[PDB]
Amino acid sequence: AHIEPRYRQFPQLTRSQVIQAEFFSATMWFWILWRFWHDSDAVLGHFPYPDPSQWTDEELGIPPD
Amino acid sequence: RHSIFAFTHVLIPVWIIHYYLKYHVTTKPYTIVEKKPRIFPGDTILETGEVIPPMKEFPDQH
Amino acid sequence: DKRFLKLLRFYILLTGIPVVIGITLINVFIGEAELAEIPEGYVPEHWEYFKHPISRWIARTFF
Amino acid sequence: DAPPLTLEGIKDRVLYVLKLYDKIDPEKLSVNSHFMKDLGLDSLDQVEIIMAMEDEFGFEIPDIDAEKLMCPQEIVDYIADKKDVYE
Amino acid sequence: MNLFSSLTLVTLILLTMPIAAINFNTHKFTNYPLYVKTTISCAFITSMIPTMMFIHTGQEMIISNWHWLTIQTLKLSLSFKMDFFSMMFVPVALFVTWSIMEFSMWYMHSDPNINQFFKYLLLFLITMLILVTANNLFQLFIGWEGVGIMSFLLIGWWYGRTDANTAALQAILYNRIGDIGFILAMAWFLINLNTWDLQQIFMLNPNDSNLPLMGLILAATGKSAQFGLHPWLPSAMEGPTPVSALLHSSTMVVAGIFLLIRFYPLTENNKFGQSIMLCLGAMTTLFTAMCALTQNDIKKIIAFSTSSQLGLMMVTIGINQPHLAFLHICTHAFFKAMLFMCSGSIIHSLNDEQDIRKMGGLFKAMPFTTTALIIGSLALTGMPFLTGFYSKDLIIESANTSYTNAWALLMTLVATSFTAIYSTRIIFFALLGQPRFPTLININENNPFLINSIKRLLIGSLFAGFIISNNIPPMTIPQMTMPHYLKMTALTVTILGFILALEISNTTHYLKFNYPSNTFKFSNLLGYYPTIMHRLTPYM
Amino acid sequence: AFLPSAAYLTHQQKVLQLYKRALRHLESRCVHRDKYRYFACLLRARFDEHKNEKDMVKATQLLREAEKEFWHGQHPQPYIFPESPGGTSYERYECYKVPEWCLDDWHPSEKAMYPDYFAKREQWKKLRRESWEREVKQLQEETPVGGPRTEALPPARKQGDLPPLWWHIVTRPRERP
Amino acid sequence: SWDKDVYPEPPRRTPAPSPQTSLPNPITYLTKAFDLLVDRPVTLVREFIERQHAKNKYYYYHREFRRVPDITECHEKDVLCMFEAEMQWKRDYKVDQEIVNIIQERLKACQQREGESHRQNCAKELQQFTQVVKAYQDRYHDLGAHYSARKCLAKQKQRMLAERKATKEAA
Amino acid sequence: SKMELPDYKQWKIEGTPLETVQEKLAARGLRDPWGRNEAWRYMGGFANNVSFVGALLKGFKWGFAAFVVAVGAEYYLES
Amino acid sequence: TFVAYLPDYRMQEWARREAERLVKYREAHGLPLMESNCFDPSKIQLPED
Amino acid sequence: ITKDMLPGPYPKTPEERAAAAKKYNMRVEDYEPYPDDGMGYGDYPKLPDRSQQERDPWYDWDHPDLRLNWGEPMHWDLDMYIRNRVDTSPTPVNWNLMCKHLFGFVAFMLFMFWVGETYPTYQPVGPKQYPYNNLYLERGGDPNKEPEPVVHYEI
Amino acid sequence: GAHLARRYLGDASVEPEPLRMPTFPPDYGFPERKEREMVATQQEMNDAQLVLQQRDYCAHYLIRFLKCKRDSFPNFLACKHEQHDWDYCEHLDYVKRMKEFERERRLLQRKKRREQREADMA
Amino acid sequence: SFPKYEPSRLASLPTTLDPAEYDISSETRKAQAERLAIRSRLKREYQLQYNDPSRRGVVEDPALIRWTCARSANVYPNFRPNTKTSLLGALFGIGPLIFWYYVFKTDRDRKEKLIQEGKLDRTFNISY
Ligand SMILES: CCCCCCCCCCCCCCCCCC(=O)OC[C@H](COP(=O)([O-])OCC(O)COP(=O)([O-])OC[C@@H](COC(=O)CCCCCCCCCCCCCCCCC)OC(=O)CCCCCCCCCCCCCCCCC)OC(=O)CCCCCCCCCCCCCCCCC
Ligand SMILES: CCCCCCCCCCCCCCCCCC(=O)OC[C@H](COP(=O)([O-])OCC[N+](C)(C)C)OC(=O)CCCCCCCCCCCCCCCCC
Ligand SMILES: CCCCCCCCCCCCCCCCCC(=O)OC[C@H](COP(=O)([O-])OCC[N+](C)(C)C)OC(=O)CCCCCCCCCCCCCCCCC
Ligand SMILES: CCCCCCCCCCCCCCCCCC(=O)OC[C@H](COP(=O)(O)OCCN)OC(=O)CCCCCCCCCCCCCCCCC
Ligand SMILES: *C(=O)CCCCCCCCCCCCC
């Protein structure tokens, strides 16, 4: 049976549309947290950015005068 | 006669278009020109059999 | 409008389908020619310089 | 989509809205309860009733027809005139 | 070679076959939309084999099959280019088109001109695949004017309406003003490089290409609705919702961007053209994403959304990162077609309601549409590890960590904030809160056409960004070293957009009425540009 | 100003049209329905403060500055109902509103596809072509000199007359053809 | 078949298939399916057509224009000789147009065939293209829509007077 | 064809923000005439709707549950 | 059908096939593919100066 | 149809003006023509130059898309003031002030892009160093000649 | 991003301008500094058809990653080791460029101290 | 107090702000009733031809026919040379001709001076 038109009230819900919406919402959060567990680096950062002030004058070749 | 859609829309057009491309297009120069396949060190050529020598051993960073 | 379109398809296909079938049979059974070098002494006809048979017939009959 | 309307449905929905109005009682209200002579209403109340009809059935009644619907049955007849019910 | 070129041409000839089917009809059809939909399904399934054998071998070719015309030095052949751009965009566009037409079998069921509608929409698909496979500028002009004229015929679909006809004439006006620059580009290439073929243009490698690149920027300004030539994309929503959904989200409006992406070996040797593209893209993505925030018609908002994303594409071409821009095309297609299909299901279930101020209560009432609309809005914002992440986050990271205009980069980030603002504006005023629609509820979404058509783009908007960004071979060096405040620039600006727009949403429930300032009056009248230039310039 | 039957708007009609436009632009500004309802009763008190104004100079002046209050306090994009002028569906289906006279030019084989419809239609055409001269002689005896004043058409009076000029008012195409 | 000496194509070198992963690719199964379902019946039909060709074999010829005297040895305002000179010049102009088109086909095919290393590995095709465009610009450019052997001769003579003046002023 | 209406008496505004509006109109001496015409939007199934931070987290529960089960299966799978 | 099978309309197919013959001839013989002079400079007299 | 319902030359006497206002089917006091300057209007009335979009849409018009009647003296630019064309409808913000807002915003943004190009931003790194004389043969250098040694060392 | 405020609000002479740098000689301050080594042969990366922006000093990791992705199809998640090797070596090249910029900056600090000593001594 | 709306030509004045709408004087009543009279006469005379079944054709509009005759036929007898017509015909008849003439003449003289000095890049221009 199709959705009966209703008046000033909440419409009829099929079981299938609600379980599909919940399944794809849970699949979205499964994918987000799944890649967040496997990658964890495309968001936060990959490689440690060095501090240019903490480099010594020996490795940068700065003879003192 | 259940899936004659594919038979009359792919399998007969694949026949016509492959007959066209095989005996009138490739028979003419530079109609189908192909980017040559990407060659890596250590590969084996199917045409000659000349094996490309590999890379130098790496100054290992890790 | 449907009568015009039905008659349009009919009076085009009425000689379209026999000409398409005739061209197909020429291409299968008579067929495209092959380029040969001109023999010594042999002066060809003007219609013999063309590759397709229908082009040869047009050059031989009318042109 | 777009469910077909009847005169009975338009009548019942207009009277259902007019029974949800606080300056109209739901027991004196009939199909010809004239809004000025009977129900003790302002013309401002008439304008609010026609605007509730527009918010109800989802189409704008123009002012030259809004200012003249003086009973619920004229409203039923005008929505039947502009929606072509009982085709 | 034998299989690749075969299936390449079979997809195009297969798509041309239902045009012959509708032109050679006598009867009334046994669901000719099912015929066109099944044609597009099998064309997608056919075209995925050249995609797979390009991912494996890296195989590309040119099909210059049919000699057409030879003007003394210019052998114009029917020349197809099966490169990375064609190999990635043809199955994406076929998939999005297949979703839109299974949407249209439901949404346009009340139409007795359904066969004419599907005929026009398949003609648009054919002209777009002429556009994206063109190896010379004459065939690309064919596909370009084809998408322009089918834009005319589908904007002016309900043709008795004056607004549709006006929007269609407006759309043709802006597209032909872009065509001025496109013809300027073709004229420069014929007079200076003696070719329309792309191969000889890339081989000769011109240096003083300021004039043809200004022509191509004018062409992309006409086609991709950049600033100056934008207002046809707001007006273009007066066509059907599947017309806007297919064309003016994912398929038509990317063609100027796709034109500039096609000529990246010309943009990579000109700092002037890239500065113009960066300035124009940042100007567009500020202006359109600002004008998106203060609209109430949902199709106006999603049109300004896709124009802001096209301005972002123009930015990330102007920073000389073209393959990320093409990834942003192939990313933006899925979720923006899905957001138009969700907005159109809200339109249909509420009996032609396109306004957000008469929505609400559709979280529970339309659960699958609300779910997919939140997913599309999060993919639009740049949620981590959706499809929008793998393009837009890398676009922000490569725009920060490169030689860039500073003010253009700041405008790109302000646009990144405004995206989250209108995304949660759509989510709030459309799905959340309480209902504001009239009292006769005809909320229904139980058709397998609608459910499957949103479902396939939903699988796409989840997985396809990951799948594409790990199946394509790399083309530049990705910048993957940057500090914590600069790697996390995009997500910080996105979350600030979320929180500030939530505070704007909480200010909608307070019982105080404030008089509107000039900011809202400026942005709500679209930045006054359809007000001045449409009343003054036709008068002149 | 410009109306078919009346030649003007009265002061009371201007006040009602201003009240209606003020509530609609308020509902535009005040999106949520409880907030609209609160400011709606506030605006109702604002209009009913001066309900009993017998000075027509004072009433028209309050109307004038109320118009100026509306003109400063309006929204640029009100909510337009879609089938209303300015909407997203106004005059959309005029591409399907084919008039009735095009049925007269059909081929008789596809009139023979609906036999009962055209047999039923010819008696409508018969009733129109007999009622036409009766309603012309109804109009020419009731209309005063120098042309009619209003555009209000008269009704039918006899038991056998149909109202004058009734064809394109009844035989108009539907809103969903 | 065309001549590879006028349309140069290098020896192709394809890599040998190296399946490292345990999953099979779809491309070998689809290549077997193509090579059985499509490549063989089309070849059968083509062999039938080829047999019907070979049952009646006949030939066409490339037309050979023997060289008539050109415009430099034709009298002024003598149409019977400069007619043949003009027809000779127009055939040579049309053939030179197609020569420039052949070198453009070489250039575009080289650019596609080399791919990303096109700027390094097509210097000879680009060099031949620049030379043939230089010769065609020196030979036929700017003659106008009423081009003839007289216009071409006058352009050549003005070019030779410029060359002679530039050489003589360098001594 | 005959559509059955709901009751006009069951839609009462008490407990809804229309009643809060009635209180804030009685605070300065007014009265609301159109409350029960709007009170269905705040009752029935449409009442107690979610906010934005939960409408994001739709599917977070079973998504995180199946995530935990899949992490456990892949960590017991490598051993 | 008639326009489709014109017998080499304005000899363009002949011209391409002749261009193939000429480039095949003068790629083997070490000749340039096209002279910059349409006619032999030995058979052109310049105006003296 | 005949001559006296087709427009003629310029009316100069008041009775010719009265006959012309009877011709265009409007009041004589409403009748105002274009001035006799030779630009080619004749006795055609100078209508108040309003767009057709301004009119009452809800009226039972004769011409529904044009918002126009039978016998009503049409505007000279009636084709120009169709609803598919130029509109004269009132806007909230004034025309002068909208032009000032749009031009000020355009000039402001273009000035800021110009200054940002004048003061470009970058990242604190060196140049991207390439081997083989900064890729000499790959960028199109000739093999017979030989470039300068572009050599980069270890840091 | 503080260096933009050091070059635009402070001075420009002690900040090395990116468009023409290094301006100091590379042997100035480095006794016996060795050259950079290219692992991938020019003929190899010509056969590999790498992009001209991709043909830097560490093209060999990218050649191995592309060979992996060709050889692991249809698995597109079997080449993270090669991708991480290539991205870490690009990280090292980016750090070397940072060290070149910081070398130029500290040598401009050295020249600033030199000229201040000359202005304060003679 | 409030921003007074400034009317423009391309954005006119509203009725509800125009001061002539609140005129209740008797001559305004007479004008509105006479305009009602002529409008009702035209409406009635139109719908007497619009609803007649014996008519099968075009209800001719002498307003529309009069307009199309004014746009095309009545131009020439009322065209008189004065200051305004002669000056606007001089500026808008041959003015942009002179502008584009000196633009294209200057551009072609510059390009010709470049070409016969051999300064212009014309390396692959062979299609003209
Ligand atoms: C069917 C009826 C349809 C309707 C008919 C009526 C049509 C309307 C009226 C028309 C009236 C005439 C008008 C004038 C035109 C005259 C014809 C003409 O000029 O032809 C020119 C031209 C030259 O023909 P030709 O000079 O005679 O022959 C060339 C050689 O000299 C000689 O070449 P050849 O000798 O080698 O060729 C011989 C050929 C005969 O020649 C012909 O057929 C040509 C004559 C027909 C031409 C028809 C043209 C009309 C338009 C057709 C297209 C539209 C149709 C409607 C729409 C359909 C849906 C799209 O033989 C065959 O066809 C046999 C092979 C069959 C292949 C298929 C099956 C193979 C496998 C079988 C397996 C099963 C058995 C296994 C076991 C076997 C055991 C033994 O012919 C064509 O162009 C033919 C059309 C097809 C071309 C290729 C199509 C695909 C191209 C794809 C890429 C390009 C498009 C990209 C689009 C992108 C998106 C937009
Ligand atoms: C689907 C049913 C079809 C009909 C059924 C029966 C026939 C089926 C076909 C079976 C195979 C037959 C043999 C193969 C076909 C013929 C082979 C052959 O040599 O053909 C000769 C040639 C091949 O090219 P060619 O190079 O030999 O000839 C060019 C012509 N000259 C040299 C004179 C200049 O023609 C064709 O094959 C025509 C194919 C046309 C395909 C594209 C159509 C485009 C339509 C739009 C036109 C405008 C384009 C604008 C853009 C241009 C580019 C910028
Ligand atoms: C002629 C000058 C005066 C002008 C006025 C003329 C009026 C009188 C009319 C007289 C008759 C007509 C004369 C002109 C005829 C020209 C046609 C002709 O002969 O063509 C030859 C061309 C010849 O092609 P060709 O130039 O490659 O030549 C091949 C050479 N032969 C045949 C010798 C090998 O015919 C064709 O191309 C026909 C091929 C089959 C049809 C095309 C296949 C695709 C069809 C369209 C599919 C859909 C495409 C996408 C569109 C989708 C929807 C938008
Ligand atoms: C990289 C470079 C980038 C540069 C960017 C900046 C430069 C370009 C600037 C924009 C130029 C075009 C815009 C001006 C014209 C806009 C016309 C238009 O859209 O008109 C719309 C109007 C009605 O539409 P509208 O009112 O919006 O609808 C809502 C409901 N009324 O419709 C109408 O009124 C109908 C009008 C029909 C007749 C129009 C006649 C005028 C034609 C003018 C041509 C101008 C040619 C300019 C050539 C420039 C060459 C360099
Ligand atoms: C200094 O920070 C150098 C980086 C480039 C110039 C400043 C860029 C500022 C925008 C990026 C971060 C935005 C964070 C909200």
User: Rounded to an integer, what distance in angstroms lies between the CA atom of residue E350 and that of residue E365?
Assistant: 11
According to DSSP, the residues that pair with B34 across neighbouring strands are E61
**Known catalytic membership, residue D42:** yes
Question: What pairing do the DSSP bridges indicate for beta strands C34-35 and G59-60?
Answer: parallel
E490 alpha carbon, closest ligand: 5
Supply the residue whose CA is at minimum distance from atom 38 of ligand 3. I4
- Closest approach of E451 to chain F, Cα-based (Å): 26
I10 alpha carbon, closest ligand: 2
Residues J58 and F85 sit within 8 Å (Cβ to Cβ): yes
> Looking at residue B45, what DSSP letter applies?
B
Q: What is residue K21's three-state secondary structure?
A: coil
Whether the CB of E110 is below 8 Å from some CB of chain D: the reply is: yes
Which among F39, F21, F22 has a CA at the least distance from the CA of F30?
A: F39
Q: Give the type of residue at J7.
A: P
Best of F26, F39, F71, F77 to substitute, by most chain E Cβ atoms within 10 angstroms, is F77
Query: Residue E273 corresponds to which tokens in the numbers above?
Result: 């053209």
Class of residue A55 by CB neighbours under 10 A (exposed 0-12, middle 13-18, buried 19+) = middle
User: Rounded to an integer, what distance in angstroms lies between the CA atom of residue A30 and that of residue A12?
Assistant: 29
- To test the pocket of ligand 2, the residue of E78, E123, E135, E186 to mutate (highest count of ligand atoms within 8 Å of its CB) is E78
Which among E41, E55, E71, E38 has a CA at the least distance from the CA of E4?
A: E55
- To test the pocket of ligand 4, the residue of E177, E272, E528, E539 to mutate (highest count of ligand atoms within 8 Å of its CB) is E177
Residues B54 and B41 sit within 8 Å (Cβ to Cβ): yes
| DSSP per-residue codes, E332-381 | HHHHHHHHHHHHHHHHHHTTS--BGGG---HHHHSHHHHHHHHHHHHHHH
Q: Do K66 and B55 touch (CB under 8 A)?
A: no
Residues with CB under 6 Å of ligand 2 are B 16, 19-20, 24; E 66-68, 76-78, 136, 138-139; I 13
Cis omega (within 30 of 0) for bond into K74: yes
**CB count in 10 Å sphere of residue A16:** 11
Residues E273 and E267 sit within 8 Å (Cβ to Cβ): yes
Query: Residue E32 corresponds to which tokens in the numbers above?
Result: 């000719």
Residues K41 and B55 sit within 8 Å (Cβ to Cβ): yes
Q: Do D1 and E438 touch (CB under 8 A)?
A: no
Cis omega (within 30 of 0) for bond into K22: yes
Whether the CB of B18 is below 8 Å from some CB of chain E: the reply is: yes
Name where chain B breaks: residue before each gap, C-N > 2.5 Å.
none
- To test the pocket of ligand 2, the residue of B8, B24, B30 to mutate (highest count of ligand atoms within 8 Å of its CB) is B24
Q: Give the type of residue at E540.
A: M
With a 6 Å cutoff on the Cβ, whether J119 touches ligand 5 is no
List Cβ neighbours of E101 (8 Å cut-off, separation of 6 or more): E33, E36, E37, E40, E118, E121, E242
Query: Residue B31 corresponds to which tokens in the numbers above?
Result: 């109609």
- Quick one: CA torsion of F65, F68, F72, F78, rounded to 10 degrees? 120
User: Rounded to an integer, what distance in angstroms lies between the CA atom of residue E480 and that of residue E487?
Assistant: 9
Atom of ligand 2 minimally distant from the CA of B23: 14
Supply the residue whose CA is at minimum distance from atom 1 of ligand 5. K1
Query: Residue J131 corresponds to which tokens in the numbers above?
Result: 């081997």
Q: What are phi and psi of K36, to 5 degrees?
A: -85, 140
Q: Do H17 and F45 touch (CB under 8 A)?
A: no
Distance of CA E483 from the midpoint of ligand 3 (Å) = 63
- Closest approach of J98 to chain E, Cα-based (Å): 6
- Quick one: CA torsion of E122, E123, E129, E135, rounded to 10 degrees? 170
Strand order across the beta sheet in which E61-70 lies: B32-34, E61-70, E75-82
Q: Do I7 and C50 touch (CB under 8 A)?
A: yes
- Closest approach of E521 to chain F, Cα-based (Å): 7
Whether the CB of I41 is below 8 Å from some CB of chain G: the reply is: yes
User: Rounded to an integer, what distance in angstroms lies between the CA atom of residue E10 and that of residue E19?
Assistant: 15
Query: Residue E386 corresponds to which tokens in the numbers above?
Result: 């959706």
List Cβ neighbours of E64 (8 Å cut-off, separation of 6 or more): B30, B31, B32, B33, E77, E78, E79, E80, E135
User: Rounded to an integer, what distance in angstroms lies between the CA atom of residue E315 and that of residue E227?
Assistant: 13
Provide long-range contacts, Cβ within 8 A and 24+ apart, for J68-71.
Answer: J69/L39, J69/L42, J69/L43, J69/L46, J70/L42, J70/L43, J70/L45, J70/L46, J70/L59, J70/L61, J70/L63, J71/J25, J71/L42, J71/L45, J71/L46, J71/L61, J71/L62, J71/L63
User: Rounded to an integer, what distance in angstroms lies between the CA atom of residue G74 and that of residue G81?
Assistant: 6
| DSSP per-residue codes, chain I | -TTTT-SSGGGHHHHHHHHHHHHHHHHHTT--SS-S-SS-GGG-PPPP-
- Closest approach of I29 to chain G, Cα-based (Å): 12
**CB count in 10 Å sphere of residue D1:** 12
User: Rounded to an integer, what distance in angstroms lies between the CA atom of residue E123 and that of residue E114?
Assistant: 14
Question: What pairing do the DSSP bridges indicate for beta strands E440-441 and G59-60?
Answer: unpaired
**CB count in 10 Å sphere of residue A46:** 17
User: Rounded to an integer, what distance in angstroms lies between the CA atom of residue L73 and that of residue L71?
Assistant: 6
| DSSP per-residue codes, E408-430 | HHHHHHHHHHHHHHHHHHHHHHH
User: Rounded to an integer, what distance in angstroms lies between the CA atom of residue I14 and that of residue I6?
Assistant: 13
Q: Do J120 and E406 touch (CB under 8 A)?
A: yes
Any idea what the Cα angle at residue E106 is, between residues E105 and E109, rounded to 5°?
Answer: 80
Q: What is residue E70's three-state secondary structure?
A: strand
Chain J residues with CB under 8 Å of K5 CB are: none
Supply the residue whose CA is at minimum distance from atom 52 of ligand 3. E16
Q: Do L42 and J10 touch (CB under 8 A)?
A: no
List Cβ neighbours of E106 (8 Å cut-off, separation of 6 or more): E348, E447, E449, E450, E453
- To test the pocket of ligand 5, the residue of J121, J123, J125 to mutate (highest count of ligand atoms within 8 Å of its CB) is J121
User: Rounded to an integer, what distance in angstroms lies between the CA atom of residue A33 and that of residue A11?
Assistant: 33
3-state secondary structure K51-115: CCCCCCCCHHHHHHHHHHHHHCCCCCCCCHHHHHHHHHHHHHHHHHHHHHHHHHHHHHHHHHHHH
Query: Residue D52 corresponds to which tokens in the numbers above?
Result: 């509730």
Whether the CB of E55 is below 8 Å from some CB of chain K: the reply is: yes
Question: What pairing do the DSSP bridges indicate for beta strands B32-34 and E61-70?
Answer: antiparallel
Which among J82, J11, J67 has a CA at the least distance from the CA of J41?
A: J11
Residues E261 and E317 sit within 8 Å (Cβ to Cβ): yes
Q: Do F76 and J59 touch (CB under 8 A)?
A: no
Which among F141, F11, F28, F120 has a CA at the least distance from the CA of F66?
A: F11
Whether the CB of E446 is below 8 Å from some CB of chain D: the reply is: no
Please provide the size of chain H in residues. Answer: 79
Chain F residues with CB under 8 Å of D58 CB are: 81
- Given D42, D63, D65, D81, which residue is catalytic? D42
Name the residue facing J60 among F1, F4, F85 (closest C-beta). F4
Which among E109, E158, E101 has a CA at the least distance from the CA of E444?
A: E109
Distance of CA E144 from the midpoint of ligand 3 (Å) = 23
Which among F8, E407, E201, C47 has a CA at the least distance from the CA of J121?
A: E407
User: Rounded to an integer, what distance in angstroms lies between the CA atom of residue J76 and that of residue J34?
Assistant: 10
User: Rounded to an integer, what distance in angstroms lies between the CA atom of residue E44 and that of residue E93?
Assistant: 9
User: Rounded to an integer, what distance in angstroms lies between the CA atom of residue A35 and that of residue E243?
Assistant: 35
User: Rounded to an integer, what distance in angstroms lies between the CA atom of residue G43 and that of residue G61?
Assistant: 28
Which among E505, E367, E362, E346 has a CA at the least distance from the CA of E425?
A: E505
Q: What is residue E215's three-state secondary structure?
A: helix
Query: Residue F115 corresponds to which tokens in the numbers above?
Result: 């036999």
- Closest approach of K48 to chain G, Cα-based (Å): 9
Domain boundaries, chain D: 1-87
| DSSP per-residue codes, F52-113 | S---HHHHHHHHHHHHHHHHHS--SS----TTSTTSSSTT-GGGT---GGGGGGS-HHHHTT
Q: Give the type of residue at H7.
A: D
**CB count in 10 Å sphere of residue K13:** 12
Q: What is residue E524's three-state secondary structure?
A: helix
Residues E223 and E259 sit within 8 Å (Cβ to Cβ): yes
Name the residue facing F94 among E161, E353, E434 (closest C-beta). E161
List Cβ neighbours of E224 (8 Å cut-off, separation of 6 or more): E253, E254, E255, E256, E257, E307, E310, E313, E314
CB-based burial, E496-510: b 16+ in 10 Å, e otherwise: ebbeebbeebeeeee
Residues K105 and K15 sit within 8 Å (Cβ to Cβ): yes
Query: Residue G15 corresponds to which tokens in the numbers above?
Result: 């890599």
Residue of D nearest to H12 (CA): D20
Distance of CA E498 from the midpoint of ligand 2 (Å) = 57
User: Rounded to an integer, what distance in angstroms lies between the CA atom of residue J74 and that of residue B61?
Assistant: 86
Q: Distance from CA of residue D36 to its chain's centroid?
A: 14
List Cβ neighbours of E481 (8 Å cut-off, separation of 6 or more): A46, A47, A49, E401, K90, K91, K94, K95
Going by beta carbons, is chain L in contact with chain I, meaning 3 or more pairs sit under 8 Å apart?
Answer: no
Distance of CA C10 from the midpoint of ligand 1 (Å) = 20
List Cβ neighbours of F95 (8 Å cut-off, separation of 6 or more): E158, E159, E160, E161
Query: Residue D58 corresponds to which tokens in the numbers above?
Result: 């989802």
Query: Residue F36 corresponds to which tokens in the numbers above?
Result: 């609209």
Q: Do L126 and E193 touch (CB under 8 A)?
A: no
Query: Residue G145 corresponds to which tokens in the numbers above?
Result: 């829509």
Q: What are phi and psi of C20, to 5 degrees?
A: -65, -45
